Design a protein around this ligand. Sequence first.
Ligand SMILES: *[C@@H]1O[C@H](CO)[C@@H](O)[C@H](O)[C@H]1NC(C)=O
Lengths: 49, 49
Amino acid sequence: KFLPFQQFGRDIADTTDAVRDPQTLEILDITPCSFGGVSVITPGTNTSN
Amino acid sequence: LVRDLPQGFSALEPLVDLPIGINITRFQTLLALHRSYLTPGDSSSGWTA
Ligand SMILES: *[C@@H]1O[C@H](CO)[C@@H](O)[C@H](O)[C@H]1NC(C)=O
């Protein structure tokens, strides 16, 4: 649970990690976006594309 | 506890916010005196709290 009268949150970074709406009395936990990158594995330009 | 001043640890949380442009340097608590209907032989009056 959060504070009785708290509004937002945060995490290790400056990013927030909480939201409150007593109407829904909701509590959540936040994480960074999935995130992704690409790496290419090529035998060689002169061997095969 | 035995002593009014504590030794444990405890934080605080926000309560309210009243906006007014009035300087504050000294305050005064208010005391309410309950009316006492003493008998004639009591010979007591003047203050009660
Ligand atoms: C790749 O292999 C072929 C085969 O002998 C060679 O002629 C060529 O010099 C090699 N390198 C490139 C960039 O084609």
